[PDB]
Design a protein around this motif. Structure first.
Motif, PDB file in Angstrom:
ATOM      1  N   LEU A  41       0.808  -1.213   0.000  1.00  0.00           N
ATOM      2  CA  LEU A  41       0.000   0.000   0.000  1.00  0.00           C
ATOM      3  C   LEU A  41       0.849   1.274   0.000  1.00  0.00           C
ATOM      4  O   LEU A  41       0.432   2.264  -0.585  1.00  0.00           O
ATOM      5  CB  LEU A  41      -0.952  -0.047   1.196  1.00  0.00           C
ATOM      6  CG  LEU A  41      -2.052  -1.103   1.092  1.00  0.00           C
ATOM      7  CD1 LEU A  41      -2.792  -1.163   2.410  1.00  0.00           C
ATOM      8  CD2 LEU A  41      -3.055  -0.784   0.019  1.00  0.00           C
ATOM      9  N   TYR A  42       2.041   1.270   0.590  1.00  0.00           N
ATOM     10  CA  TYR A  42       3.003   2.357   0.416  1.00  0.00           C
ATOM     11  C   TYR A  42       3.658   2.342  -0.968  1.00  0.00           C
ATOM     12  O   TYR A  42       3.867   3.405  -1.536  1.00  0.00           O
ATOM     13  CB  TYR A  42       4.053   2.339   1.531  1.00  0.00           C
ATOM     14  CG  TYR A  42       3.586   2.901   2.861  1.00  0.00           C
ATOM     15  CD1 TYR A  42       3.056   4.198   2.922  1.00  0.00           C
ATOM     16  CD2 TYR A  42       3.733   2.167   4.047  1.00  0.00           C
ATOM     17  CE1 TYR A  42       2.641   4.741   4.146  1.00  0.00           C
ATOM     18  CE2 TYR A  42       3.323   2.701   5.275  1.00  0.00           C
ATOM     19  CZ  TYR A  42       2.766   3.990   5.326  1.00  0.00           C
ATOM     20  OH  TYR A  42       2.314   4.476   6.499  1.00  0.00           O
ATOM     21  N   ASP A  43       3.933   1.182  -1.567  1.00  0.00           N
ATOM     22  CA  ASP A  43       4.465   1.088  -2.932  1.00  0.00           C
ATOM     23  C   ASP A  43       3.490   1.649  -3.981  1.00  0.00           C
ATOM     24  O   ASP A  43       3.908   2.375  -4.875  1.00  0.00           O
ATOM     25  CB  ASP A  43       4.820  -0.377  -3.217  1.00  0.00           C
ATOM     26  CG  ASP A  43       5.570  -0.640  -4.532  1.00  0.00           C
ATOM     27  OD1 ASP A  43       6.399   0.190  -4.949  1.00  0.00           O
ATOM     28  OD2 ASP A  43       5.379  -1.728  -5.117  1.00  0.00           O
ATOM     29  N   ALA A  63      -7.906  -0.503 -10.377  1.00  0.00           N
ATOM     30  CA  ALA A  63      -7.583   0.359 -11.505  1.00  0.00           C
ATOM     31  C   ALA A  63      -8.799   1.208 -11.874  1.00  0.00           C
ATOM     32  O   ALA A  63      -9.921   0.786 -11.598  1.00  0.00           O
ATOM     33  CB  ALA A  63      -7.151  -0.518 -12.673  1.00  0.00           C
ATOM     34  N   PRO A  64      -8.635   2.366 -12.519  1.00  0.00           N
ATOM     35  CA  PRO A  64      -7.391   3.052 -12.801  1.00  0.00           C
ATOM     36  C   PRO A  64      -6.844   3.733 -11.546  1.00  0.00           C
ATOM     37  O   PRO A  64      -7.589   4.371 -10.812  1.00  0.00           O
ATOM     38  CB  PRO A  64      -7.762   4.088 -13.857  1.00  0.00           C
ATOM     39  CG  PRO A  64      -9.178   4.476 -13.464  1.00  0.00           C
ATOM     40  CD  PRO A  64      -9.740   3.164 -12.966  1.00  0.00           C
ATOM     41  N   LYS A 105       3.254  -4.156  -9.704  1.00  0.00           N
ATOM     42  CA  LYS A 105       3.253  -2.940  -8.883  1.00  0.00           C
ATOM     43  C   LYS A 105       1.877  -2.542  -8.350  1.00  0.00           C
ATOM     44  O   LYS A 105       1.810  -1.784  -7.392  1.00  0.00           O
ATOM     45  CB  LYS A 105       3.821  -1.761  -9.686  1.00  0.00           C
ATOM     46  CG  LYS A 105       5.332  -1.814  -9.889  1.00  0.00           C
ATOM     47  CD  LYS A 105       5.842  -0.532 -10.541  1.00  0.00           C
ATOM     48  CE  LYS A 105       7.348  -0.564 -10.794  1.00  0.00           C
ATOM     49  NZ  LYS A 105       7.832   0.620 -11.502  1.00  0.00           N
ATOM     50  N   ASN A 106       0.787  -3.042  -8.925  1.00  0.00           N
ATOM     51  CA  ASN A 106      -0.574  -2.661  -8.546  1.00  0.00           C
ATOM     52  C   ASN A 106      -1.170  -3.488  -7.387  1.00  0.00           C
ATOM     53  O   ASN A 106      -2.040  -3.001  -6.673  1.00  0.00           O
ATOM     54  CB  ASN A 106      -1.425  -2.740  -9.809  1.00  0.00           C
ATOM     55  CG  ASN A 106      -2.846  -2.309  -9.563  1.00  0.00           C
ATOM     56  OD1 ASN A 106      -3.733  -3.114  -9.349  1.00  0.00           O
ATOM     57  ND2 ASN A 106      -3.099  -1.033  -9.554  1.00  0.00           N
ATOM     58  N   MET A 107      -0.758  -4.741  -7.190  1.00  0.00           N
ATOM     59  CA  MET A 107      -1.326  -5.632  -6.173  1.00  0.00           C
ATOM     60  C   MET A 107      -0.976  -5.190  -4.749  1.00  0.00           C
ATOM     61  O   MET A 107       0.134  -4.757  -4.488  1.00  0.00           O
ATOM     62  CB  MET A 107      -0.886  -7.068  -6.443  1.00  0.00           C
ATOM     63  CG  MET A 107      -1.831  -7.750  -7.412  1.00  0.00           C
ATOM     64  SD  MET A 107      -1.083  -8.969  -8.511  1.00  0.00           S
ATOM     65  CE  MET A 107      -0.674  -7.906  -9.868  1.00  0.00           C
ATOM     66  N   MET A 108      -1.922  -5.325  -3.819  1.00  0.00           N
ATOM     67  CA  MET A 108      -1.854  -4.817  -2.443  1.00  0.00           C
ATOM     68  C   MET A 108      -1.242  -5.792  -1.409  1.00  0.00           C
ATOM     69  O   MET A 108      -1.452  -5.615  -0.214  1.00  0.00           O
ATOM     70  CB  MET A 108      -3.231  -4.292  -2.030  1.00  0.00           C
ATOM     71  CG  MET A 108      -3.769  -3.245  -2.998  1.00  0.00           C
ATOM     72  SD  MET A 108      -5.331  -2.485  -2.527  1.00  0.00           S
ATOM     73  CE  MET A 108      -5.500  -1.282  -3.855  1.00  0.00           C
ATOM     74  N   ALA A 109      -0.486  -6.792  -1.848  1.00  0.00           N
ATOM     75  CA  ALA A 109       0.389  -7.607  -1.006  1.00  0.00           C
ATOM     76  C   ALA A 109       1.813  -7.619  -1.585  1.00  0.00           C
ATOM     77  O   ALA A 109       1.990  -7.496  -2.798  1.00  0.00           O
ATOM     78  CB  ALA A 109      -0.183  -9.017  -0.869  1.00  0.00           C
ATOM     79  N   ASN A 162      -5.937   3.503   3.733  1.00  0.00           N
ATOM     80  CA  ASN A 162      -7.291   3.044   4.028  1.00  0.00           C
ATOM     81  C   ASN A 162      -8.254   3.274   2.866  1.00  0.00           C
ATOM     82  O   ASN A 162      -9.214   2.532   2.685  1.00  0.00           O
ATOM     83  CB  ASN A 162      -7.782   3.766   5.287  1.00  0.00           C
ATOM     84  CG  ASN A 162      -6.981   3.428   6.513  1.00  0.00           C
ATOM     85  OD1 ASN A 162      -6.225   2.476   6.539  1.00  0.00           O
ATOM     86  ND2 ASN A 162      -7.121   4.173   7.576  1.00  0.00           N
ATOM     87  N   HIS A 163      -7.970   4.285   2.055  1.00  0.00           N
ATOM     88  CA  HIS A 163      -8.680   4.636   0.837  1.00  0.00           C
ATOM     89  C   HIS A 163      -8.407   3.627  -0.282  1.00  0.00           C
ATOM     90  O   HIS A 163      -9.340   3.210  -0.955  1.00  0.00           O
ATOM     91  CB  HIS A 163      -8.254   6.065   0.498  1.00  0.00           C
ATOM     92  CG  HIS A 163      -9.170   6.866  -0.367  1.00  0.00           C
ATOM     93  ND1 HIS A 163      -9.311   8.249  -0.265  1.00  0.00           N
ATOM     94  CD2 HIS A 163      -9.855   6.430  -1.454  1.00  0.00           C
ATOM     95  CE1 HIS A 163     -10.067   8.617  -1.305  1.00  0.00           C
ATOM     96  NE2 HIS A 163     -10.406   7.546  -2.026  1.00  0.00           N
ATOM     97  N   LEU A 164      -7.171   3.147  -0.446  1.00  0.00           N
ATOM     98  CA  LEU A 164      -6.861   2.052  -1.377  1.00  0.00           C
ATOM     99  C   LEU A 164      -7.527   0.728  -0.990  1.00  0.00           C
ATOM    100  O   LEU A 164      -8.073   0.053  -1.858  1.00  0.00           O
ATOM    101  CB  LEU A 164      -5.351   1.822  -1.449  1.00  0.00           C
ATOM    102  CG  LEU A 164      -4.552   2.846  -2.243  1.00  0.00           C
ATOM    103  CD1 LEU A 164      -3.083   2.488  -2.137  1.00  0.00           C
ATOM    104  CD2 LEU A 164      -4.928   2.859  -3.713  1.00  0.00           C
TER     105      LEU A 164
END
Ligand SMILES: CC(=O)O[C@H]1C(=O)[C@@]2(C)[C@H]([C@H](OC(=O)c3ccccc3)[C@]3(O)C[C@H](OC(=O)[C@H](O)[C@@H](NC(=O)c4ccccc4)c4ccccc4)C(C)=C1C3(C)C)[C@]1(OC(C)=O)CO[C@@H]1C[C@@H]2O
Ligand SMILES: CC(=O)O[C@H]1C(=O)[C@@]2(C)[C@H]([C@H](OC(=O)c3ccccc3)[C@]3(O)C[C@H](OC(=O)[C@H](O)[C@@H](NC(=O)c4ccccc4)c4ccccc4)C(C)=C1C3(C)C)[C@]1(OC(C)=O)CO[C@@H]1C[C@@H]2O
Ligand SMILES: Nc1nc2c(ncn2[C@@H]2O[C@H](COP(=O)(O)OP(=O)(O)OP(=O)(O)O)[C@@H](O)[C@H]2O)c(=O)[nH]1
Ligand SMILES: Nc1nc2c(ncn2[C@@H]2O[C@H](COP(=O)(O)OP(=O)(O)O)[C@@H](O)[C@H]2O)c(=O)[nH]1
Ligand SMILES: Nc1nc2c(ncn2[C@@H]2O[C@H](COP(=O)(O)OP(=O)(O)O)[C@@H](O)[C@H]2O)c(=O)[nH]1
Ligand SMILES: [Mg+2]
Lengths: 430, 426, 426
Positions: free
Chosen positions: C207-209, C271-272, C297-301, C226-228
């Motif tokens: 989530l920081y990446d 996305a987007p 780069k998009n995945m949250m783990a 928390n928004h992501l």
């Protein structure tokens, strides 16, 4: 309608009276000269004359001049009718038999004549409020002479009686046990509800709640008057649940001889703490069940409660009171008798407690007086009849009583009648 | 035209009464002066049911106000509507009842009843056709319990065929203010079971449960409790005051509500009741009025109806509503809850429908339950009575008025006979 | 109609939850007061999925809020949307979890779960047809990890056939705030593998990446993280809240996404996502949504999917778009990247298409990956656990709550069994 005749006897009764009438004058807005600047709320305690002067429905009686001559000279000299401040020449000497048989025998038919002239100004007189010391010669002997007369002259009328009673350790006299035991016939036969109070219990309340380290009697009398203002408040004022002086007795008194309730008041509080405590209805209700606030040195947890009158005054609502007594019923340390499943008589009155401006006791939105019939009070009798037994086994002072016209057998007949009352309060707990 | 005579006894009866007179004066559009100021002809059409016409078109309510103390008369006469009542109809003593039934019935009120009853005659002789007596009182304390049941006995003997209809605030253990409450009530219930045609059993514990668990009031007063009682008092007489699709007189209620003569201890309720901050989110309609009305939290006595069965329920609806929808919901309730109604009665619900809903709501329903669950109200008083009476506690205050110990034994005997007759149909 | 019950545990679960309730209230057009203020009938058509109707057309969200400290309830109740939730649904202790799983599961939350579970009943009994439970929590610390998995166990035993669906923020080495994080997570993953039907594995490092390498935020807060998370929470339920060309319930996801019962540790994406200063230069369209959605780069783990193979991917699209173009891109991805999908499943991509894109964008896609690369998230926690546990470090804080050393041995045993089942299909 709704009058009370207040009779103040001996030094203790007169000095409690000098606090009662200090309070009632402030609470009704009567000046110490009896006038009223600008509803009949005063009518219970004051007769009104056509000049616009309110004269108290009180009799002050002492067998010696000193204390009433001070009432006749201080700030209230213009309040009272001059012939209802009644004095003899001769002190009763802490001897019951001087009060009853020898000295009070002369003043009694003048004391009755004033009480007659007060009752004839009433229209539906509610009762008598009789203030005295159990330990005094005038306190025991003259009150017992007077009550015997009022109980044939006014047999239907309720006789409420406020007694300063001997303590566990604090005492002012050697013969205090003799005068108190000789009084037990008066309270049993010629009284309808008798409020025992103790100097040593109020001295401890003063130390713990007012934080006054060394109180006088003016501090005690300002608490004892505050309870009678709260007993009479439903007679004097509007409320959500006003309590009549016989409605009170029909809930306090389970049996004809079981009419010795404890009394307590909450919050007793100083201006140092009253601004930091909440003083919610829940707290001032719970304060009445603490051994710390009982005005007789006995522990209510060594008894069972028969009935409680919670007489609230000031800003309270029946929601809050029911929610409060529900917590008292939940606590297993506060034990009622099996035969009183209801337990609580509630009174609620819209008039806050009046502050005496010179006093230690702080301004507060609420108060409760709890008047409470409980088996525990029999220990205050078991203390004092053990003081009596040590002295009567020697006949230790008996020649002063026999020398002033008393039968020697009255001491045995009084210790006997006290043992039958101490039996009755143990018998009904079961 | 079907006049009612209304009588108020003791502090509670004069307080639920003095609020009732503010409620029905708002309905009939009568000013605190007694002058008419209403919108509608229907308000004036039956104003005779509760009022007398007097000069200048002032209306004087047909209340008799009874107490053994002046202080409640003084509190009513000085109150929001106090100037409305006839000065001659305030009948009072000076020394109170002492919370003693025997002072009410034998001494203090036995002196006063000769001065009460002769005023009940002046109002009943001014009636064109009296239908009944509507008496407000409490069964705790001594004035309402003991003088009010003396007065029921005297009016019953004089008017044997008119409806005697009483609203009776009565004791419960968790909300109590009197030590001798159980005694006074047991001596008083013994008179109600024989003389009244209907008695509406009301409880301060249930009136506080409505205030906390429905209305969400933070500090409910006796003025808020008196408002719940007086809504159901206005409710049950509605059908002789206003027009309707189904009219029901107090007698048309009694014939349907009382199967066996003595089973007339009813249990009232009211709808809609809503939390004050929540009204805009609620739909006022017959199935929501029903789902409130028939739920155990709404009834004004401590009895949960799930501890018994109903004999009869009457639902007196008010407002513009469908008879199909009313008849549908009063069917759906007693079929989906069939274990809570007696199965030797083929329909347990009476319905009535008035065309005129209370001022400020589109519909309303007053509920009257008759249920075997009312055994629990008489049982808990009878067991509090028993635990004091086995040790003769407090009896010198009653026997001092010349009452026998045998009258306590006979009252608690008649109380268990009332408990047994409801428990018989369980 | 397919109601969800939502539950928030500890600081993280109440923070990703209290942001989620701001996101779905914007979608459904609900005001911070709880009043409806939206544009469209479609916003109101399924408002029952996450809310209860109450009086005045106020909507009350079906959240239960759970904590062992008052301070997060105080922070939520005072927050942007805090006044929306039911006061009774805030269930809390006073003394916290101490970042201890055993305080959550055995002491401080074992006291509180009786007060939580009986609120989960009031919400689930108010449902017309409950589809499932949606629980937000963290696997580090003690409240979310240990009380939240106690609560999963209790709700699983009571509702065995409803979907249990959890959003689970969990530890990683380069973004850590707790010493005992590895212990708490290993004790908690042992409950998730047995009880949940889906668990969405989320990481603060990933989530920081997204915040630095995609959005180009200079100072991303927990409010931005928390928004992501809450965008993908709104994403996966979309097909029971709005109409679509292909509808997919949470169960229609589970049947397609979980080949073997225990392989339900998913990995979400969205996305987007565009750098805030760059939006005008980007074409929003299905092949650009795809080239973002399927990139590491998009995945949250923290797992790079290039370290494993996918079992199943679900792409839940939203917006007005072609089914040929969606079906073309979800084919082109798994044929051009065929070395990254398991070759014993003949099509690895589920698609769904909702007609209603998020407020303010023309299209959106929520991505759910199931991949053998999730072994790396369980492996690095298991090796941090092992390096402390070989020297029994910190265990007196857990064994002080009456927990066994055998429960640590059995948790890390069950963790390596989960690592082995993903590594088996590699
Ligand atoms: C805008 C609005 O919706 O106003 C309502 C209101 O908010 C609510 C909450 C009212 C309100 O009731 C109370 O506040 C209340 C408080 C304690 C005890 C009883 C009531 C209301 O005051 C009460 C009032 O009801 C009446 O006026 C009836 O006609 C009632 N009579 C009186 O209450 C009354 C008040 C003062 C003087 C004289 C009469 C009545 C009931 C039965 C039979 C005849 C008359 C109404 C509609 C409302 C308010 C004003 C907020 C409610 O009461 C009634 C009877 O409708 C309480 O639950 C209902 C639902 C209503 O929605
Ligand atoms: C003019 C314009 O193009 O505005 C966009 C915008 O500039 C961008 C950068 C937005 C913007 O997003 C962020 O700033 C952001 C920051 C941290 C974490 C997450 C987002 C935007 O704020 C976010 C906002 O998105 C939404 O409102 C969605 O409906 C979203 N809900 C919320 O963000 C939301 C905010 C406040 C209160 C309640 C909800 C959502 C997402 C998934 C499911 C349901 C709802 C949008 C379109 C924009 C702005 C306003 C600049 C982006 O987000 C979304 C969800 O579209 C970030 O990358 C996308 C691409 C957008 O172009
Ligand atoms: N609280 C309080 N107690 C008092 C006061 N005055 C006296 N007492 C108590 O009075 C008790 C003894 O009674 P006395 O004061 O001797 O009573 P008395 O009637 O004047 O007795 P005699 O002089 O014999 O007539 C003691 O226990 C005192 O503590 C007073 O003003 N307040
Ligand atoms: N609802 C209601 N109850 C009251 C009111 N006043 C008193 N009560 C309660 O019901 C009982 C009534 O007894 P009360 O009327 O005082 O006895 P009485 O005056 O001798 O008839 C009291 O103990 C209170 O608990 C009132 O205004 N409203
Ligand atoms: N995304 C997100 N992560 C948080 C938040 N608050 C804390 N965290 C992180 O994730 C972990 C959550 O643990 P926490 O919720 O504090 O434990 P608990 O309160 O005992 O359940 C912390 O160590 C932080 O690194 C938040 O608001 N959002
Ligand atoms: Mg003296």
């Amino acid at each position: 309608m709704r009058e009370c005749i207040s009779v103040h006897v001996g030094q203790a009764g007169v000095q409690i009276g000098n606090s009662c009438w200090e309070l009632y004058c402030l609470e009704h807005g009567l000046q110490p000269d009896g006038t009223m600047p600008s509803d009949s709320s005063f009518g219970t305690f004051f007769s009104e004359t056509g000049s616009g002067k309110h004269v108290p429905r009180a009799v002050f009686v002492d067998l010696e001049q000193t204390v009433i001559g001070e009432i006749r000279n201080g700030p209230y000299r213009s309040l009272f009718h001059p012939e209802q401040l009644i004095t003899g020449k001769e002190d009763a000497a802490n001897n019951y038999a001087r009060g009853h048989y020898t000295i009070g025998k002369e003043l009694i038919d003048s004391v009755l004549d004033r009480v007659r002239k007060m009752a004839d100004q009433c229209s539906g007189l509610q009762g008598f409020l009789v203030f005295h010391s159990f330990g005094g010669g005038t306190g025991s002997g003259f009150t017992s002479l007077l009550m015997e007369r009022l109980s044939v002259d006014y047999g239907k009328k309720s006789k409420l009686e406020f007694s300063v009673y001997p303590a566990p350790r604090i005492s002012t006299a050697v013969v205090e046990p003799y005068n108190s035991i000789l009084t037990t016939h008066t309270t049993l036969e010629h009284s309808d509800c008798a409020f025992m109070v103790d100097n040593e219990a109020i001295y401890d309340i003063c130390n713990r709640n007012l934080d006054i380290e060394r109180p006088s009697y003016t501090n005690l009398n300002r608490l004892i008057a505050q309870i009678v203002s709260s007993i009479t408040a439903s007679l004097r004022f509007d409320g959500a649940l006003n309590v009549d002086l016989t409605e009170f007795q029909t809930n306090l008194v389970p049996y004809p001889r079981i009419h010795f309730p404890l009394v307590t008041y909450s919050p007793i509080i100083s201006a140092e703490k009253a601004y930091h405590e909440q003083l919610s209805v829940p707290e001032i209700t719970n304060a009445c069940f603490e051994y710390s606030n009982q005005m007789v040195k006995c522990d209510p947890r060594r008894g069972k409660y028969m009935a409680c009158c919670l007489l609230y005054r000031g800003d309270v609502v029946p929601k809050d009171v029911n929610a409060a007594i529900a917590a008292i019923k939940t606590r297993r340390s506060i034990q009622f008798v099996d035969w009183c499943p209801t337990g609580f008589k509630v009174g609620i009155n819209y008039q806050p407690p009046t502050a005496v401006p010179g006093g230690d006791v702080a301004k507060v939105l609420r108060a409760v007086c709890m008047l409470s019939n409980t088996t525990a009070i029999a220990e205050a009798w078991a203390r004092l009849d053990h003081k009596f037994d040590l002295m009567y086994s020697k006949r230790a002072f008996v020649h002063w009583y026999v020398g002033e016209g008393m039968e020697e057998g009255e001491f045995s007949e009084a210790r006997e009648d006290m043992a039958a009352l101490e039996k009755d309060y143990e018998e009904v707990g079961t | 035209m079907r006049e009612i005579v209304h009588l108020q006894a003791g502090q509670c009866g004069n307080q639920i009464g003095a609020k009732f007179w503010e409620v029905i004066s708002d309905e009939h559009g009568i000013d605190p002066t007694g002058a008419y100021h209403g919108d509608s002809d229907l308000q004036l059409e039956r104003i005779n049911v509760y009022y007398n016409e007097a000069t200048g078109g002032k209306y004087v309510p047909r209340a008799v106000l009874v107490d053994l103390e002046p202080g409640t008369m003084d509190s009513v006469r000085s109150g929001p509507f106090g100037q409305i009542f006839r000065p001659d109809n305030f009948v009072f003593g000076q020394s109170g009842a002492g919370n003693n039934w025997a002072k009410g019935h034998y001494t203090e009120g036995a002196e006063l009843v000769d001065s009460v009853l002769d005023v009940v005659r002046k109002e009943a002789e001014s009636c064109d056709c009296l239908q009944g007596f509507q008496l407000t009182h409490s069964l705790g304390g001594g004035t309402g319990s003991g003088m009010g049941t003396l007065l029921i006995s005297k009016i019953r003997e004089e008017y044997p065929d008119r409806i005697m209809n009483t609203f009776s605030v009565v004791p419960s253990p968790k909300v109590s203010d009197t030590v001798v409450e159980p005694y006074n009530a047991t001596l008083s219930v013994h008179q109600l079971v024989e003389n009244t045609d209907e008695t509406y059993c009301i409880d301060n514990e249930a009136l506080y449960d409505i205030c906390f668990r429905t209305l969400k009031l933070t500090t409910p007063t006796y003025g808020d409790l008196n408002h719940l009682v007086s809504a159901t008092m206005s409710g049950v007489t509605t059908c002789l005051r206003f027009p309707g699709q189904l009219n029901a007189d107090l007698r048309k209620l009694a014939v349907n509500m009382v199967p066996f003569p003595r089973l007339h201890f009813f249990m009232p309720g009211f709808a809609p009741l809503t939390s004050r901050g929540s009204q805009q989110y609620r739909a006022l309609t017959v199935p929501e009025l029903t789902q409130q009305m028939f739920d155990a939290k709404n009834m004004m006595a401590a009895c949960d109806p799930r501890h018994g069965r109903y004999l009869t329920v009457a639902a007196i609806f008010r407002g513009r509503m469908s008879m199909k929808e009313v008849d549908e919901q009063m069917l759906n309730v007693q079929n989906k809850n069939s274990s809570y109604f007696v199965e030797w009665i083929p329909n347990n619900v009476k319905t009535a429908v008035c065309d005129i809903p209370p001022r400020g709501l589109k519909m309303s329903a007053t509920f009257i339950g008759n249920s075997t669950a009312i055994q629990e109200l008489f049982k808990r008083i009878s067991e509090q009575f028993t635990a004091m009476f086995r040790r003769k506690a407090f009896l010198h205050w009653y026997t001092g008025e010349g009452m026998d110990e045998m009258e306590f034994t006979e009252a608690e005997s008649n109380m268990n006979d009332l408990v047994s007759e409801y428990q018989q149909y369980q």
